[PDB]
Symmetry: C2
Subunit: 114 residues, 2 copies
């Protein structure tokens, strides 16, 4: 799948399972359309996302519900969510893997394409 997502937990050294992730597509008008959604797996990964050229180029947004992730634990978090806004589109069909490493007061996001 053209777009994959992976989330890890830096506090426990494990995949961030059961994490909600919504994918928005920047619409015709200045605004955000719901594009895809899922919950991370046992592997902390989300595959079923989108298709080949349902996925076309545009600005996308990956919203990660980190707040819920943390409270589930009993942790006091800082961010409301983790957000990743990218442009899909150079000259190519790629493969986008967005990774996110979660801490209560800190997070990193990285992109790996091919």
């Amino acid at each position: 799948c053209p777009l994959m997502v992976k989330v890890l937990d830096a506090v426990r050294g494990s995949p961030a399972i059961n994490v909600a992730v919504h994918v928005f597509r920047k619409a015709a008008d200045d605004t955000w359309e719901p594009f895809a959604s899922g919950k991370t797996s046992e592997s902390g990964e989300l595959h079923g996302l989108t298709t080949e050229e349902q996925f076309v180029e545009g600005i996308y947004k990956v919203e990660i519900d980190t707040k819920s992730y943390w409270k589930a634990l009993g942790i006091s978090p800082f961010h409301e969510h983790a957000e990743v806004v990218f442009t899909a589109n150079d000259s190519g069909p790629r493969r986008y893997t967005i990774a996110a490493l979660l801490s209560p007061y800190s997070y990193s996001t990285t992109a790996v394409v091919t």
Copy 2:
């Protein structure tokens, strides 16, 4: 200052200067209002922001224009910008220091609350 931002460049090992930062305050209606704006200083810092109880309780968004920074450089980044969303004030009027560490395809955001 109640709200401070610091931004570093992991590619060059220096403060990220002249990076535009917009601060939004989630308004009465489900929506974002402009609250403060500025650019990072020679030391990668933005202090001019807000004040005492002007800064009120609420959900704010700190949007760092990473895209323009990398472009000015000759680098073609992945992120459109770096967004930081948080609930402020609650159990205290706090002091917020938001740190960002940028790379072309990666960014990390950390918060220091006192």
